From a paper:
The periplasmic binding protein (PBP) CeuE1 is an important component of the Fe(III) uptake system in Campylobacter jejuni, a commensal Gram-negative bacterium in the avian gut, but a common source of food poisoning in humans. CeuE, an integral part of the CeuBCDE ABC transporter of C. jejuni, is responsible for capturing Fe(III)-siderophore complexes in the periplasm for delivery to their respective inner membrane transporter. C. jejuni does not itself synthesize siderophores, but capitalizes on their secretion by other bacteria, such as E. coli. Here we report a combined solution and structural study of a series of synthetic tetradentate analogues of the enterobactin-derived bis(2, 3-dihydroxybenzoyl-L-Ser), to explore the ligand-binding promiscuity of CeuE, both wild type and with mutations of the Fe(III) binding residues H227 and Y288.
To probe the relative contributions of His227 and Tyr288 to Fe(III)-siderophore binding, site-directed mutagenesis was then used to replace the side chains of the two Fe(III)-coordinating amino acids with non-coordinating side chains of similar size. His227 was mutated to either leucine (H227L) or alanine (H227A), while Y288 was mutated to phenylalanine (Y288F). All five mutants (Y288F, H227L, H227A, H227L/Y288F, H227A/Y288F) were crystallized in their apo form, and all structures are closely similar to that of wild type CeuE. However while there is clear electron density for the Y288F mutation in its three structures, H227L and H227A are located in a flexible loop region and there is generally no electron density to confirm their presence. In contrast, the effect of mutating the histidine was less pronounced. Mutants H227L and H227A gave Kd values of 22 ± 10 nM and 35 ± 14 nM, respectively, indicating only slightly weaker binding than for wild type, which indicates that the tyrosinate O-donor binds the Fe(III) cation more strongly than the histidine N-donor. The Λ-configuration signal was observed for mutants H227L and H227A, indicating that these do indeed bind Λ-Fe-5-Lic. The resulting Kd values show trends similar to that observed for wild type, but with systematically weaker binding.
Numbering used by the authors: 22 to 251, 255 to 310
């Protein structure tokens, strides 16, 4: 299990420990640079927009356009360190995609990691939300919102068919990769309890390289597609063949194209963006 964030209250600051290291973080930080999209959504949800001074305003998705005029500190993959320094922030918040930049960010300002543990997604989301809330004294508000998401999960689980199985795939122009439980797409299996056609896909970010023959072999009842092409080529075209057509998922129009701006960008730290993803699965399978 990923080490959670722990915090001790030291008057006008917190001593904070997470999996990447220790930071003294001021109470009520007023100049926050956020590189994790999900936790930026959580700042919205907690009414903290005015604390934010920098975002990755290159890739910003549709649901985060209230931040489109904030100073940009980069994109989905690149970080602009000159920019972050010029903002003179009091806190930087990052998740897994940015752990590679930890030491250089921490030379600028305290750097808080809000990682999502693929083996323990809900506990890490809750810990990430509540920890940001504690910086601002908003535990009450955050616990209410976390309750709302737990309720949503229970409504979603309650309609899942125990006998049906799903496959998760990531598509490229000319390649399909499969993902399973405890992957970065895993909440479909792990949180919502939809069974997988293959619970033994090996752990790792590249997933398992597959073909349409594999898909027909597994004969999923649902196929969840995350289309990285979102190129001319789309997942609909990769899957437009007589092997896939034969599957229960094809025949029942349960090939589901999930919005990559949520799944691929892994916005699970968002109080609203997680909800959106929960409902997107629910609605696909009810």
């Amino acid at each position: 299990a990923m080490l959670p964030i722990s915090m001790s209250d030291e008057g006008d600051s917190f001593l904070v420990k997470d999996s990447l290291g220790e930071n003294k973080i001021p109470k009520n930080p007023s100049k926050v640079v956020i590189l994790d999209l999900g936790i930026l959504d959580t700042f919205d949800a907690l009414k903290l927009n005015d604390k934010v001074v920098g975002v990755p305003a290159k890739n910003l998705p549709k649901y985060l356009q209230q931040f489109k005029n904030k100073p940009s500190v980069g994109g989905v993959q690149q970080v602009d360190f000159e920019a972050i320094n010029a903002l003179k922030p009091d806190l930087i918040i990052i998740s897994g995609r940015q752990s590679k930049f930890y030491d250089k960010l921490k030379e600028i300002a305290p750097t808080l990691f809000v990682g999502l543990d693929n083996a323990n997604f809900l506990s890490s989301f809750e810990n990430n939300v509540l920890s940001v809330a504690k910086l601002y004294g908003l535990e009450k508000e955050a616990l209410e919102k976390i309750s709302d998401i737990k309720n949503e999960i229970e409504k979603a689980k309650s309609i899942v068919d125990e006998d049906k199985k799903a496959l998760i795939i990531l598509t490229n122009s000319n390649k399909i990769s499969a993902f399973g439980p405890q992957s970065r797409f895993g909440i479909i299996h792990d949180v919502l309890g939809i069974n997988a056609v293959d619970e033994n896909i090996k752990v790792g970010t590249a997933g398992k390289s597959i073909n349409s023959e594999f898909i027909l072999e597994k004969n999923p009842d649902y196929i969840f597609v995350v289309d990285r092409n979102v190129n001319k080529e789309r997942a609909q075209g990769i899957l437009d063949n007589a092997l896939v057509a034969k599957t229960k998922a094809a025949q029942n129009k349960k090939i589901i194209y999930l919005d990559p701006e949520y799944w691929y960008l892994a916005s699970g730290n968002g109080l609203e963006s997680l909800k959106t993803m929960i409902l997107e699965i629910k609605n696909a399978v009810k």
